[PDB]
Amino acid sequence: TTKEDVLEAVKERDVKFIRTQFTDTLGIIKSWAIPAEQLEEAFENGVMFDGSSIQGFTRIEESDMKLALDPSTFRILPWRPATGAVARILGDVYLPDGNPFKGDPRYVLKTAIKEAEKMGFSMNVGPELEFFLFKLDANGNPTTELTDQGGYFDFAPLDRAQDVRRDIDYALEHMGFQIEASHHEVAPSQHEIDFRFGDVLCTADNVVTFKYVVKSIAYHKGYYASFMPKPLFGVNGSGMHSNQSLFKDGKNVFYDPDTPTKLSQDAMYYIGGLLKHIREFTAVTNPVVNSYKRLVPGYEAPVYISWSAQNRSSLIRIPATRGNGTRIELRCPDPACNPYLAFALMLRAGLEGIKNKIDPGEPTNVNIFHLSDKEREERGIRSLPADLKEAIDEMKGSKFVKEALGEHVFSHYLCAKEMEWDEYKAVVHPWELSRYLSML
Amino acid sequence: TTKEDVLEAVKERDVKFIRTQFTDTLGIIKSWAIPAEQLEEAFENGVMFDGSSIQGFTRIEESDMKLALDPSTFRILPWRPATGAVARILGDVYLPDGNPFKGDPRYVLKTAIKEAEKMGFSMNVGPELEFFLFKLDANGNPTTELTDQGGYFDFAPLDRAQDVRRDIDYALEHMGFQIEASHHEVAPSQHEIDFRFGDVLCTADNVVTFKYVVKSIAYHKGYYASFMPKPLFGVNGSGMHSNQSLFKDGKNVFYDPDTPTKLSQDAMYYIGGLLKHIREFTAVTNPVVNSYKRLVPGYEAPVYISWSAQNRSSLIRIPATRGNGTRIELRCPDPACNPYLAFALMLRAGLEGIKNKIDPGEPTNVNIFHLSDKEREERGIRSLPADLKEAIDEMKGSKFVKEALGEHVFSHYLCAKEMEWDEYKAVVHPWELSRYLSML
Amino acid sequence: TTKEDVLEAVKERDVKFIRTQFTDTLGIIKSWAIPAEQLEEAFENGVMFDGSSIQGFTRIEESDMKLALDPSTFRILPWRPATGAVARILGDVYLPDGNPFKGDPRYVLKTAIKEAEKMGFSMNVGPELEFFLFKLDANGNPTTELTDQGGYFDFAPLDRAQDVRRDIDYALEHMGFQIEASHHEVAPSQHEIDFRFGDVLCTADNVVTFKYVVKSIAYHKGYYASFMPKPLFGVNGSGMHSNQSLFKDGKNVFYDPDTPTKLSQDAMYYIGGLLKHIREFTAVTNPVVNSYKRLVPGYEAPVYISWSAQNRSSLIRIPATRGNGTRIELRCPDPACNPYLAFALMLRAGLEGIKNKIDPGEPTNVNIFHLSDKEREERGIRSLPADLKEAIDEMKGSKFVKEALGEHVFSHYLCAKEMEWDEYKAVVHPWELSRYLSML
Ligand SMILES: Nc1ncnc2c1ncn2[C@@H]1O[C@H](COP(=O)(O)OP(=O)(O)O)[C@@H](O)[C@H]1O
Ligand SMILES: Nc1ncnc2c1ncn2[C@@H]1O[C@H](COP(=O)(O)OP(=O)(O)O)[C@@H](O)[C@H]1O
Ligand SMILES: Nc1ncnc2c1ncn2[C@@H]1O[C@H](COP(=O)(O)OP(=O)(O)O)[C@@H](O)[C@H]1O
Ligand SMILES: C[S@](=O)(CC[C@H](N)C(=O)O)=NP(=O)(O)O
Ligand SMILES: C[S@](=O)(CC[C@H](N)C(=O)O)=NP(=O)(O)O
Ligand SMILES: C[S@](=O)(CC[C@H](N)C(=O)O)=NP(=O)(O)O
Ligand SMILES: [Mg+2]
Ligand SMILES: [Mg+2]
Ligand SMILES: [Mg+2]
Ligand SMILES: [Mg+2]
Ligand SMILES: [Mg+2]
Ligand SMILES: [Mg+2]
Ligand SMILES: [Mg+2]
Ligand SMILES: [Mg+2]
Ligand SMILES: [Mg+2]
């Protein structure tokens, strides 16, 4: 798809508004509309916006930013009226002088893809995204009231969101997605939708799309879709399971029928590199305070650093599917993260495993939550950052994460997350009053 | 049907989503949707799911499970829209490598069918599960409020669920059910729908279907369908009378016009066999704590172990119908049980009766509830397990049930029921506060 | 005062009930009443109780505990009726075989006092206890609603605890306290009563007596006295400043009339030891999760390890008073701490500072909250443990704190605090739903 095909699709399908979109450094999608009559000149001039009103983008005395449109991302939004049909287009962020903005999260992922190509590979991540369907209130703003008390794979009337989950599938299919499965998840009113994997760029655009498509579809039905990692205590949390495989010559490099476990050496080294660096960018994968209330044992979320086949208690699970389905599933990432930065760091953590032949230890093919602390330390197992501050500390000292993100993204990400933590740590919570007020 | 017929029916009838379904060990239906485009892939590769999130199924270190589809069990759900028509397919659970997971209740029932064939028989059970129709609250959750005060065979306006029952029959007919009759039952808001008998596999699939079809239609019509055996006190409860029969060369083996009572010797031995073993697997037919509030005298629910013709106070009634309709009605089970396990155990017990020529005693052709304890003890009549713990104890000590179920199903059924009961024996109920708390 | 004097006072002042009391490991006062008629024999037989129902005392297999009475602690409670006058007696916890149970906080403080005696010193401590006065709801339960909006030294009607503080001072004077000054504190509805210092044992007893006297007096007037460090956010917290000096031959050892700053060398060494060991037992001085929400900058609660004269932003302030009155004010602790453990650890740290001439650096006669991180790092200033887990970690690796507390107190304190933190670390607070749940 070129700029000329987008204009033809705008005329043929009667598009009136194009929503130019980009993602800010914290993974939030920023969008604004232009008339179709402007598209042409936009394509040769770029749209202009204010970078000082975007998180971690640019300062107020140098605030003008340009957005250059990517014609390949032209999609048509199906939940908006077909008369004045509304399309969307994602773009890259440029400085007004003309150079690409190094602070663009979508540029970091492109830079990582460059190194992947230099080594002759291409990441083919495809994520599992889970969300919660809560009820709205009179005004129409989010709540945490459950829409049902169902469980895993539960049928109606325990599962009350199947009519609201057909339309998500339909919208995704109209937006170029390839749905694979759709089901209720372990937590009450928690659902998960899986779509086919693809290139890292397309998959990250799909992640941000999927998120806002799901939220918009839920809103127009009376509910609210929340991709918050741990909205409820004592039940499962939402994860963003990142299954990834390297592809060379259009073949799965991670597959090897001759070796035991049908896992090639490049997959072993990729795992080794992924484990050597996960501690450093857990801040990126789990970027909010809530994402660390999900990393507690007993809810199928990782707490320690390990890897084993078929083990949904471990960090790097290897599903049983071999052949063109041989991938590694990283289970830490949360749907609240920035997919561009997260995928970039995953990509070049594996590429540090291949260039340095980083052998991981023996797999821990056992439940790790049912181990003593002595058992865990004797086996060499280490734990993930306990809270967001510990992850921030592990991230600041990193040279790998700074080299991957770059100075601007590194510094601005850290500055936002430190402010978040400083706001969090001073707060007095109702738990503290209900625990200490009467006893002291 | 076959694979190709399913695809032809998906194209011809315009099916968009296929709901792949199975049954967990405790009898709950677990389903999830895949696009029709995925169907051809799911027939050659199976659909993978998490076994660790299914009750009594598999552990979290080897949690991957495959599910292979059964083309014959392909139906089209009528209460879902006809534009994006939704079908369902039941499957058999497999270990991810190649094996037919033995913890699957469907596999247990198939194993019992194998022994039936080895003896040259085929069970033809047809059940008559009852249910209650309660009202939903403002949110739409189940309540125990009555939808009518009617009784047995009551007409309107005492019977207020004629439209609900008519639409349930309509949907069941579209799902391939041969409806026999439909009526109000003794308890208020309690209804019963009867469909033709068939092969035990088909009728177990039909039991699970019937249940979720009824529940979904009731939900969409405003009410809640409850298969709880004893939802209300003082009124009779819901049971799943299993009318069992053996067929050889397409002829009812239990029929014998020359013998008195028109019951063959094989029927006699089957009665003796499943009378000697019921105490052992009452924890399967009656699997929940509420299941034994139903087994109290005075409500046409069995309390003792006996058989007699047309006696609705006895454990094994023999209806008056002879000829092709000659069967034996085991009245103990609830609709809360797992039909795959329950029918398997009944079939195995009957076949064990036939092998060892187990003659039952004389038929107790009296109201057993009216007999005294001395009368029952002198007549040799035994009682069923009084509560869930007694049934668990009678079941774990048995070798017949362990052989029939297998180690995995046996142990994971015990464990589940023991944890269920241990959570119930420690509860302080408002009955104890209404009785005590003022006298003490 | 001895047993004979206690009996004489019981007869003379018409006492019927004696509240035998002791402090548990976590600082909570546990008491029970015995009739005066039993006193005469309790003195020679102790009073037996159940140690398994006391936090960190003993196990259920060996739960029988004895408590011996201390006649010197006999006080008469003035807020209870004078007809059947009620007295109190603090006890020492023994073991039924007969030995000074080492898990007793009183025993730990007594061991620290013995350690001091060998060096010729006697520790004098004057606590600085602040509290909040909140309203009680309809049922008489604690709330967090303010009883006034006054500030520091505010007069009525801005200060609305005139009568409450007047009667608290009266009760404390009746219980042998020498009241120094009562005033309104910085936070709204925060109050401070100061009493004269004394021997560390006597003032450790006074600390628990003060808290329960204040709580009872406030309760009888319709309020709730809260000794919670940080019950409200954005407002000063309650701290228990430990003013401490060393006396040798009835003279203040910390005073030196001919020396700059008029502080003796022993005072300098005591400061050095306190500073060098503070990080290790911050889990004792600040033992609850809420005590580290008080240790935030901008509220006159210390955040960093420093010392300077008249600096209320410093960890160790040295007030301007000299002569009899020269002390060091450790501002770290909060009222929620166990005074017996806290004073014991401070005394041991100071004595360890004196034994090895631990010179502290130059004082930081500067506001430290206003310094940058770079400035603090350049000056070598270390920060206090950021949260309860950090303090727990710093305490576990300590050999000094284990030496002072002992194996039993050490281990049981660690266990209680780790359980507390693990309960707190997994909670989802409303702050997380107000911040996220719309952003995500
Ligand atoms: N070779 C591959 N490389 C990367 N991702 C893949 C590959 N094969 C499958 N996937 C993706 O893995 C995801 C697995 O999702 P799903 O099977 O629903 O959950 P789980 O695998 O945790 O049971 C799918 O979204 C799919 O697109
Ligand atoms: N030969 C047979 N074998 C097994 N089941 C049968 C046979 N004949 C009839 N049935 C079943 O017995 C059930 C009888 O139900 P119904 O007559 O409504 O209640 P009841 O028999 O208790 O009065 C029907 O569902 C029918 O399918
Ligand atoms: N020599 C001393 N040793 C120990 N404590 C002392 C000494 N002199 C006074 N104190 C105590 O110091 C405390 C000072 O309280 P306060 O007047 O509020 O001081 P500040 O306002 O500086 O905190 C009093 O409780 C008093 O008993
Ligand atoms: C059953 S679950 O196993 C739930 C995982 C949980 N929500 C989490 O990873 O945080 N994971 P998956 O969808 O990969 O099967
Ligand atoms: C009158 S009843 O006859 C008794 C049903 C009752 N609810 C029971 O628990 O078995 N059932 P049916 O007529 O189907 O034999
Ligand atoms: C005005 S205050 O300065 C109170 C400080 C605060 N309550 C705290 O130490 O946490 N200090 P002090 O009581 O010693 O005079
Ligand atoms: Mg999934
Ligand atoms: Mg999932
Ligand atoms: Mg997964
Ligand atoms: Mg019937
Ligand atoms: Mg019936
Ligand atoms: Mg019947
Ligand atoms: Mg003061
Ligand atoms: Mg003060
Ligand atoms: Mg002070």
Numbering used by the authors:
A (entry chain D), B (entry chain E), C (entry chain J): 8 to 447
The publication says:
The enzyme, glutamine synthetase (GS; EC 6.3.1.2, L-glutamate: ammonia ligase) plays a central role in cellular nitrogen assimilation by incorporating ammonium into glutamine, which serves as a carbon and nitrogen donor for the biosynthesis of nucleotides, amino acids and lipids. Here we describe a structural dissection of the archaeal Methanosarcina mazei (Mm) GS and its regulation. Like the Gram-positive GS, the Mm GS active sites are formed at the interface between two subunits in the hexamer and are comprised of five regions; the E flap (Mm residues 303–310), the Y loop (residues 369–377), the N loop (residues 235–247), the Y179 loop (residues 152–161) and the D50 ´ loop (residues 56-71), which is the only active site region contributed from the adjacent subunit. Like other GS dodecamers, the Mm GS dodecamer is formed by two interfaces; hexamer and inter-hexamer interfaces.
To address this question, we reacted Mm GS with the GS inhibitor L-methionine-S-sulfoximine (MSO) and ATP and obtained a 2.7 Å cryo-EM structure. Notably, the proximity of the region composed of residues 167-168, which form a distinct interface in the apo Mm GS structure compared to the low G + C GS, did not impact Mm TS formation; the Mm GS TS adopts the same active site and loop structure for residues 167-168 as the bacterial GS TS. Like other GS, Mm GS undergoes large conformational changes compared to its apo form upon Met-Sox-P formation. In the Mm GS TS structure, the ADP is anchored into the active site pocket, next to the Met-Sox-P. The ADP adenine ring is contacted by GS residues Ser252, Phe204, Gly332 and Arg334, while the ADP β-phosphate is hydrogen bonded to Arg319 and Arg324. The Met-Sox-P is contacted by GS residues His248, Arg319, Arg324 and Arg338. Because Arg319 and Arg324 interact with both ADP and the Met-Sox-P, they help orient the molecules in the active site. At the other end of the pocket, the side chain of Mm GS residue Arg301 contacts both oxygens of the Met-Sox-P carboxyl moiety and the sulfoxime atoms are bound by Mm GS residues Glu137, Glu192 and Glu199. GS catalytic residues Glu307 and Asp57 cover the active site, which positions the Glu307 side chain for proton abstraction of the ammonium. Although the Mm GS TS structure and interactions are similar to other GS, to further test the Mm GS TS structural model we mutated Mm GS residues Asp57, Phe204, Glu307 and Arg319, which the structure indicates are key for Met-Sox-P formation, to alanines and performed enzyme assays.
